[PDB]
Enzyme design. Structure first.
Site, PDB file in Angstrom:
ATOM      1  N   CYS A 106     -17.051  -8.182   2.135  1.00 57.42           N
ATOM      2  CA  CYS A 106     -17.776  -9.426   2.419  1.00 57.42           C
ATOM      3  C   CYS A 106     -18.828  -9.357   3.546  1.00 57.42           C
ATOM      4  O   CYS A 106     -19.841 -10.062   3.470  1.00 57.42           O
ATOM      5  CB  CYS A 106     -16.811 -10.601   2.647  1.00 57.42           C
ATOM      6  SG  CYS A 106     -15.750 -10.474   4.093  1.00 57.42           S
ATOM      7  N   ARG A 156     -11.748   3.612   2.272  1.00 55.49           N
ATOM      8  CA  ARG A 156     -10.940   3.570   3.491  1.00 55.49           C
ATOM      9  C   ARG A 156     -10.198   4.895   3.665  1.00 55.49           C
ATOM     10  O   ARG A 156      -9.592   5.393   2.722  1.00 55.49           O
ATOM     11  CB  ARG A 156      -9.913   2.432   3.439  1.00 55.49           C
ATOM     12  CG  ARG A 156     -10.505   1.044   3.343  1.00 55.49           C
ATOM     13  CD  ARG A 156      -9.437  -0.027   3.402  1.00 55.49           C
ATOM     14  NE  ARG A 156     -10.063  -1.343   3.409  1.00 55.49           N
ATOM     15  CZ  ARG A 156      -9.419  -2.482   3.624  1.00 55.49           C
ATOM     16  NH1 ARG A 156      -8.106  -2.476   3.860  1.00 55.49           N
ATOM     17  NH2 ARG A 156     -10.098  -3.630   3.613  1.00 55.49           N
ATOM     18  N   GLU A 195      -7.236   6.325   4.391  1.00 59.37           N
ATOM     19  CA  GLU A 195      -5.822   5.947   4.506  1.00 59.37           C
ATOM     20  C   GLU A 195      -4.991   7.051   5.157  1.00 59.37           C
ATOM     21  O   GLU A 195      -5.460   8.171   5.328  1.00 59.37           O
ATOM     22  CB  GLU A 195      -5.234   5.590   3.133  1.00 59.37           C
ATOM     23  CG  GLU A 195      -5.874   4.374   2.451  1.00 59.37           C
ATOM     24  CD  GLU A 195      -5.500   3.046   3.097  1.00 59.37           C
ATOM     25  OE1 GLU A 195      -4.475   2.974   3.812  1.00 59.37           O
ATOM     26  OE2 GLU A 195      -6.221   2.061   2.871  1.00 59.37           O
ATOM     27  N   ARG A 215      -2.146   3.037  -3.114  1.00 55.65           N
ATOM     28  CA  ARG A 215      -2.764   3.268  -1.803  1.00 55.65           C
ATOM     29  C   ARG A 215      -3.828   4.373  -1.867  1.00 55.65           C
ATOM     30  O   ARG A 215      -3.572   5.521  -1.503  1.00 55.65           O
ATOM     31  CB  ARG A 215      -1.688   3.609  -0.755  1.00 55.65           C
ATOM     32  CG  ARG A 215      -2.145   3.444   0.687  1.00 55.65           C
ATOM     33  CD  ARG A 215      -0.954   3.301   1.636  1.00 55.65           C
ATOM     34  NE  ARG A 215      -1.393   2.897   2.972  1.00 55.65           N
ATOM     35  CZ  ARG A 215      -1.651   1.639   3.335  1.00 55.65           C
ATOM     36  NH1 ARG A 215      -1.504   0.642   2.470  1.00 55.65           N
ATOM     37  NH2 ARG A 215      -2.059   1.376   4.571  1.00 55.65           N
ATOM     38  N   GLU A 259     -14.515  -9.336  -4.416  1.00 57.73           N
ATOM     39  CA  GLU A 259     -14.496 -10.069  -3.141  1.00 57.73           C
ATOM     40  C   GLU A 259     -15.058 -11.466  -3.349  1.00 57.73           C
ATOM     41  O   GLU A 259     -16.153 -11.629  -3.862  1.00 57.73           O
ATOM     42  CB  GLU A 259     -15.292  -9.362  -2.024  1.00 57.73           C
ATOM     43  CG  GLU A 259     -15.308 -10.125  -0.638  1.00 57.73           C
ATOM     44  CD  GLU A 259     -13.989  -9.987   0.159  1.00 57.73           C
ATOM     45  OE1 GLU A 259     -13.141  -9.177  -0.273  1.00 57.73           O
ATOM     46  OE2 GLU A 259     -13.796 -10.686   1.209  1.00 57.73           O
ATOM     47  N   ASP A 313      -0.691 -13.350   2.620  1.00 60.50           N
ATOM     48  CA  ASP A 313      -0.507 -12.143   1.813  1.00 60.50           C
ATOM     49  C   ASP A 313       0.424 -12.351   0.616  1.00 60.50           C
ATOM     50  O   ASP A 313       1.508 -12.921   0.753  1.00 60.50           O
ATOM     51  CB  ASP A 313       0.073 -11.025   2.682  1.00 60.50           C
ATOM     52  CG  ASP A 313      -0.989 -10.130   3.292  1.00 60.50           C
ATOM     53  OD1 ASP A 313      -2.205 -10.428   3.174  1.00 60.50           O
ATOM     54  OD2 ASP A 313      -0.592  -9.102   3.889  1.00 60.50           O
ATOM     55  N   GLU A 352       1.786  -5.289  -0.871  1.00 59.49           N
ATOM     56  CA  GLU A 352       0.751  -6.307  -0.726  1.00 59.49           C
ATOM     57  C   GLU A 352      -0.308  -6.032  -1.784  1.00 59.49           C
ATOM     58  O   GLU A 352      -0.846  -4.927  -1.848  1.00 59.49           O
ATOM     59  CB  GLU A 352       0.160  -6.276   0.689  1.00 59.49           C
ATOM     60  CG  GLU A 352      -0.960  -7.293   0.966  1.00 59.49           C
ATOM     61  CD  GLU A 352      -2.348  -6.686   0.892  1.00 59.49           C
ATOM     62  OE1 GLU A 352      -3.229  -7.121   1.657  1.00 59.49           O
ATOM     63  OE2 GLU A 352      -2.567  -5.758   0.080  1.00 59.49           O
ATOM     64  N   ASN A 389      -4.617 -11.169  -1.144  1.00 63.46           N
ATOM     65  CA  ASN A 389      -4.674 -11.976   0.069  1.00 63.46           C
ATOM     66  C   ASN A 389      -5.696 -13.110   0.021  1.00 63.46           C
ATOM     67  O   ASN A 389      -6.643 -13.064  -0.757  1.00 63.46           O
ATOM     68  CB  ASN A 389      -4.853 -11.101   1.322  1.00 63.46           C
ATOM     69  CG  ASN A 389      -6.292 -10.610   1.537  1.00 63.46           C
ATOM     70  OD1 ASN A 389      -6.574 -10.000   2.571  1.00 63.46           O
ATOM     71  ND2 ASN A 389      -7.195 -10.857   0.581  1.00 63.46           N
ATOM     72  N   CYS A 443     -12.349 -15.851   2.767  1.00 64.44           N
ATOM     73  CA  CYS A 443     -12.551 -14.782   1.807  1.00 64.44           C
ATOM     74  C   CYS A 443     -11.222 -14.410   1.157  1.00 64.44           C
ATOM     75  O   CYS A 443     -10.154 -14.743   1.675  1.00 64.44           O
ATOM     76  CB  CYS A 443     -13.228 -13.570   2.464  1.00 64.44           C
ATOM     77  SG  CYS A 443     -12.177 -12.611   3.582  1.00 64.44           S
ATOM     78  N   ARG A 482      -4.186  -2.363  -6.965  1.00 68.26           N
ATOM     79  CA  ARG A 482      -2.929  -2.973  -6.505  1.00 68.26           C
ATOM     80  C   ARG A 482      -2.314  -3.861  -7.574  1.00 68.26           C
ATOM     81  O   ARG A 482      -1.106  -3.864  -7.745  1.00 68.26           O
ATOM     82  CB  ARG A 482      -3.153  -3.788  -5.227  1.00 68.26           C
ATOM     83  CG  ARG A 482      -3.593  -2.971  -4.015  1.00 68.26           C
ATOM     84  CD  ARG A 482      -2.403  -2.282  -3.369  1.00 68.26           C
ATOM     85  NE  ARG A 482      -2.802  -1.433  -2.250  1.00 68.26           N
ATOM     86  CZ  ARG A 482      -2.842  -1.823  -0.977  1.00 68.26           C
ATOM     87  NH1 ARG A 482      -2.514  -3.065  -0.640  1.00 68.26           N
ATOM     88  NH2 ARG A 482      -3.215  -0.965  -0.037  1.00 68.26           N
TER      89      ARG A 482
HETATM   90  N1  LIG Z   1      -6.016   1.647   0.217  1.00 64.84           N
HETATM   91  C1  LIG Z   1      -6.172   0.645  -0.680  1.00 64.84           C
HETATM   92  N2  LIG Z   1      -6.037   0.876  -1.995  1.00 64.84           N
HETATM   93  C2  LIG Z   1      -6.190  -0.090  -2.921  1.00 64.84           C
HETATM   94  N3  LIG Z   1      -6.490  -1.361  -2.620  1.00 64.84           N
HETATM   95  C3  LIG Z   1      -6.667  -1.740  -1.324  1.00 64.84           C
HETATM   96  C4  LIG Z   1      -6.513  -0.736  -0.260  1.00 64.84           C
HETATM   97  N4  LIG Z   1      -6.734  -1.368   0.906  1.00 64.84           N
HETATM   98  C5  LIG Z   1      -6.999  -2.665   0.617  1.00 64.84           C
HETATM   99  N5  LIG Z   1      -6.968  -2.886  -0.712  1.00 64.84           N
HETATM  100  C6  LIG Z   1      -7.196  -4.185  -1.390  1.00 64.84           C
HETATM  101  O1  LIG Z   1      -8.045  -5.025  -0.598  1.00 64.84           O
HETATM  102  C7  LIG Z   1      -7.373  -6.245  -0.279  1.00 64.84           C
HETATM  103  C8  LIG Z   1      -7.779  -6.724   1.102  1.00 64.84           C
HETATM  104  O2  LIG Z   1      -7.733  -5.638   2.020  1.00 64.84           O
HETATM  105  P1  LIG Z   1      -6.764  -5.701   3.299  1.00 64.84           P
HETATM  106  O3  LIG Z   1      -7.473  -5.088   4.479  1.00 64.84           O
HETATM  107  O4  LIG Z   1      -6.145  -7.073   3.396  1.00 64.84           O
HETATM  108  O5  LIG Z   1      -5.597  -4.702   2.828  1.00 64.84           O
HETATM  109  P2  LIG Z   1      -4.364  -4.366   3.801  1.00 64.84           P
HETATM  110  O6  LIG Z   1      -3.906  -5.644   4.469  1.00 64.84           O
HETATM  111  O7  LIG Z   1      -4.752  -3.166   4.631  1.00 64.84           O
HETATM  112  O8  LIG Z   1      -3.221  -3.923   2.750  1.00 64.84           O
HETATM  113  P3  LIG Z   1      -2.254  -2.684   3.097  1.00 64.84           P
HETATM  114  O9  LIG Z   1      -1.838  -2.913   4.535  1.00 64.84           O
HETATM  115  O10 LIG Z   1      -1.117  -2.808   2.103  1.00 64.84           O
HETATM  116  O11 LIG Z   1      -3.153  -1.484   2.892  1.00 64.84           O
HETATM  117  C9  LIG Z   1      -5.892  -5.921  -0.380  1.00 64.84           C
HETATM  118  O12 LIG Z   1      -5.114  -7.077  -0.692  1.00 64.84           O
HETATM  119  C10 LIG Z   1      -5.859  -4.902  -1.499  1.00 64.84           C
HETATM  120  O13 LIG Z   1      -5.769  -5.559  -2.766  1.00 64.84           O
HETATM  121 MG   LIG Z   2      -4.164  -8.771   3.495  1.00 72.53          MG
HETATM  122 MG   LIG Z   3      -5.866  -0.496   3.610  1.00 74.73          MG
HETATM  123 ZN   LIG Z   4     -13.333 -10.194   3.201  1.00 76.56          ZN
END
Ligand SMILES: Nc1ncnc2c1ncn2[C@@H]1O[C@H](COP(=O)(O)OP(=O)(O)OP(=O)(O)O)[C@@H](O)[C@H]1O
Ligand SMILES: [Mg+2]
Ligand SMILES: [Mg+2]
Ligand SMILES: [Zn+2]
Ligand SMILES: Nc1ncnc2c1ncn2[C@@H]1O[C@H](COP(=O)(O)OP(=O)(O)OP(=O)(O)O)[C@@H](O)[C@H]1O
Ligand SMILES: [Cl-]
Ligand SMILES: [Cl-]
Ligand SMILES: [Zn+2]
Lengths: 489, 477
Positions: free
Chosen positions: A309, A339, A341, A350, A358, A403, A419, A422, A448, A455
């Site tokens: 966003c 990201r 990870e 993950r 978004e 969440d 998760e 959100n 947002c 996921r």
């Molecule tokens: N590594 C990832 N793989 C797949 N989808 C992701 C990932 N990170 C985030 N997302 C998606 O983006 C959305 C918003 O990102 P957000 O930063 O809230 O994830 P997050 O809170 O870090 O989740 P988690 O802690 O389980 O990685 C999440 O609800 C998820 O659907």
């Molecule tokens: Mg979240």
């Molecule tokens: Mg993440």
């Molecule tokens: Zn956002």
């Protein structure tokens, strides 16, 4: 908690064109009135700034200035500068130039010690009774730029983090579905690999989706469009995927996103001659000279899409919205988010490269809360009626994140839920960050919500399996006839 | 000048029987392979047994030392109880003929490079393992390709017209990007050559996508996949992009570690100064692992790499439209016709030579229908044997009568390039070929909107029916 007073101590002198010794009677009179009038403005009773002492030179007027949290010394000194200029310029015929800092001391309440780190403008640090004392290396330009306020906010953040926000997660359950039978217990990622749905890509935590997996992603997308975005009046836009420092500065991500981003560097030049050495190295060795390339790329301009966003907000940055235009309700599904990870390989639950829709909304406080509520109602319908999954939602004041979490049966009865969705109410953060105003002058809020297709897939397939005969009828109708994959020998 | 290609080597292995051995070698052993007696020959003999051999093109000096590795192991093995450990080099010099004084270049395993009378002389830093791995061979080939470029190689791209539509009336004359900016369709993103698309512009993008899906991909039986967008060196090496794509790439570096303590200094610097420390960040990021999506199709090929396809599976016909391509464009300021971040539907097919050619014609048929009947644009196509690219071009009225036409669509026959590069085989053993075709949504938009304008009333009926009611944008005070 420590009750020690937040205190600022400034020792400084004003630059003068000549020696204003005779004007002592006027100088002393203005300081006493400042302590009772000028330096009191903007502060609660008896909490205004004080000039504690004063002395003269043959080209300088020095003082020791003290303050609490209000009418701070780096703010009060410029107040005294503008008064001293007008009072001495008209009658006494003498000019005041710049301000010279001799010492800047901040005392901050804290319970625990802090490890001192390389921070700009901080000369030294020492533990004192009730908190921390900072010595600052700061001139008049830095004071005008409000560097001391930024240093204070930073130290207050570090103080809070060391003692308070230490619990890994604080979690508040809002709604939970009645548990369901879970006859499928395979890790969906392993099943998808075995049955030819997808393969690992070349990059870390990256996947290539065959026709079967792609069909699933596309069906979730179709569900979000038809069951949520269209009936709620959302309009499709295209948000940029390469995110610059400018964007993250305004979004606040520049405060700490660094450990998780994939950084992007342009070439320093497009000149072939500059890159010939790289090409030549590869043709001779059959190896890409990554050390050389790093030398030849520019400094990073930012990184790949992280939260999705933020780059949108450049569309509304610096603008005033008419009241007729709010609520602004938009979405983007134009590409990948990246990201870095945790170590250890994962399944699609993950990944380092994901695909998210978004959803962004902007309006008054009440319009933003209402929009959030609309989204929650649509998501509940989707997860209960269409996907028919077992799930819950938890809240991590109306500002914050809700969440959605779902069990993955392959993780066992005591496994951690995933998760997968959100909804975030962001308050005024983004409108303030990107300087977006509302015509009526009322405060602008935004929210947002991100749908991560990986996921949703991880949750749906973990709970329902890969066989369409065992999928909810409502999901089956939307998928159509599943495509075949690419068969190998 | 015109010199003779020459190899020169001095090395040692780490008295009467060895003396007659080198007299025979120059006439019998080191002669085979050479057509007219150009074989290798020793000039300096020394007893550590040092050699100095010379050679031309054929029976190369690096191959000559391993022939003597065979003979000296037999003539001294059981005879004098000697077992050689290896070879170490003291000198390796190559003399290559050249036309002009060639530019100074840094190249691996080259110690020094200099211009001489006949051409170029160059010393090498090679051991035995290096000449076993054919390093001198690759160095020679590289420098010869540059010599041919300094003699002939000039900047040129082929063109040959196949079909052009009869001239049309062009009532709309604005730069569509300017009109779009004026009427609130889009705005520039923060990044170079980058755009943010408002609801009106996004609708156009999603309309073209719908047309491609319904008029082309569905009728021809293409199946959607999702290709990775972060591309690693592994992929580009197999695709051949690692040979020269470097000037246009947006490079991607992960952090050296996720340790937040390692990044605290960067975050603290920003919080105090409100300036992100890009110099410090560059030291703290890893070397690039690759770059962002350039051609879009290469990362797909990891799906089939090393695999054998059953004959029932071909032609394999897939597409991707899951994200952005990134490219560092030349020039300065452009409209959406030339951006650094674009959105493409990448179409890929794999099969026998004949099926690949058939698939291309199927695509040409559908594009023609789309451009003539639905978009109703003025356009042409040109060929750039069967392996190559067909470019679609269209006029942009704002560029004027003499304006240069815009490439907005291509169909490429890639031959066996990708199956070979990624080691993909067919069960029957017949050669796999492949093709690809990328639909650039920005380009289609620049063409359509420059020719038809931004008012839906002036658009062809067939396009308006697929658009629906145009959305309103976001309006600012
Ligand atoms: N590594 C990832 N793989 C797949 N989808 C992701 C990932 N990170 C985030 N997302 C998606 O983006 C959305 C918003 O990102 P957000 O930063 O809230 O994830 P997050 O809170 O870090 O989740 P988690 O802690 O389980 O990685 C999440 O609800 C998820 O659907
Ligand atoms: Mg979240
Ligand atoms: Mg993440
Ligand atoms: Zn956002
Ligand atoms: N700078 C750009 N802006 C917008 N669209 C672009 C840009 N560059 C390429 N495209 C789109 O991508 C299509 C193909 O580009 P190109 O001719 O470079 O082939 P490629 O497959 O991307 O590269 P390569 O031939 O090296 O594999 C173009 O027809 C156009 O639709
Ligand atoms: Cl982002
Ligand atoms: Cl690519
Ligand atoms: Zn391609």
């Amino acid at each position: 908690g420590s009750h020690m007073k937040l205190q600022f101590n400034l020792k400084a002198y004003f630059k003068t064109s000549a020696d204003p010794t005779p004007a002592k009677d006027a100088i002393a009179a203005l300081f006493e009135e400042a302590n009772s009038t000028l330096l009191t403005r903007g502060a609660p009773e008896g909490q205004g700034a004080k000039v504690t002492e004063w002395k003269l030179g043959e080209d300088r007027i020095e003082l020791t200035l003290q303050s609490g949290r209000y009418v701070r010394v780096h703010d009060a000194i410029f107040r005294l500068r503008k008064q001293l200029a007008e009072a001495l310029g008209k009658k006494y015929k003498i000019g005041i130039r710049g301000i010279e800092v001799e010492s800047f001391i901040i005392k901050v309440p804290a319970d625990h010690e802090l490890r001192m780190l390389k921070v700009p403008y901080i000369k030294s640090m020492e533990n004192i009774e009730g908190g921390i004392q900072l010595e600052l290396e700061v001139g008049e330009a830095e004071m005008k730029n409000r560097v001391p306020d930024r240093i204070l906010t930073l130290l207050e953040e570090k103080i809070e983090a060391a003692q308070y926000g230490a619990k890994a997660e604080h979690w508040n359950l809002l709604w939970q579905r009645e548990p369901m039978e879970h006859p499928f217990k395979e890790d969906p990622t392993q099943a998808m690999m075995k049955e030819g749905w997808l393969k690992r890509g070349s990059s870390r935590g990256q996947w290539i989706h065959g026709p079967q997996s792609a069909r699933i992603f596309r069906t979730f997308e179709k569900i979000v469009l038809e069951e949520l975005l269209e009936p709620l009046g959302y309009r499709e836009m295209i948000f940029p995927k390469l995110v610059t420092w400018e964007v993250w500065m305004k979004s606040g991500h520049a405060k700490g996103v660094y450990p998780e981003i994939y950084y992007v560097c342009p070439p320093q030049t497009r000149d072939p001659d500059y890159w010939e050495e790289v090409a030549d190295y590869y043709k001779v060795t059959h190896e890409v000279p990554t050390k050389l390339i790093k030398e030849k790329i520019a400094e990073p301009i930012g990184g790949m899409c992280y939260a999705q966003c933020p780059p949108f907000w450049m569309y509304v940055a610096g603008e005033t919205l008419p009241n007729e235009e709010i609520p602004v309700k938009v979405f983007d599904r134009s590409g990948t988010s990246h990201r870095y990870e945790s170590g250890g390989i994962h399944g699609i639950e993950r990944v380092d490269e994901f695909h998210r829709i978004e959803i962004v909304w902007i309006g008054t406080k009440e319009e933003v809360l209402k929009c959030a509520e609309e989204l929650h109602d649509r998501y509940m319908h989707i997860f209960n009626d269409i996907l028919d999954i077992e799930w819950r939602k938890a809240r991590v004041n109306t500002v914050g994140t809700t969440d959605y979490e779902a069990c993955l049966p392959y993780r066992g009865p005591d496994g951690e839920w995933l998760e997968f969705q959100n909804v975030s109410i962001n308050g005024d953060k983004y409108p303030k960050g990107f300087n977006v105003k509302l015509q009526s002058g009322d405060e602008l809020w935004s929210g947002c919500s991100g749908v991560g297709l990986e996921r949703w897939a991880a949750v749906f397939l973990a709970q329902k399996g890969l066989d369409p005969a065992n999928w909810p009828e409502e999901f089956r109708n939307r998928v159509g006839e599943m495509p075949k994959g690419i068969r190998f020998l």
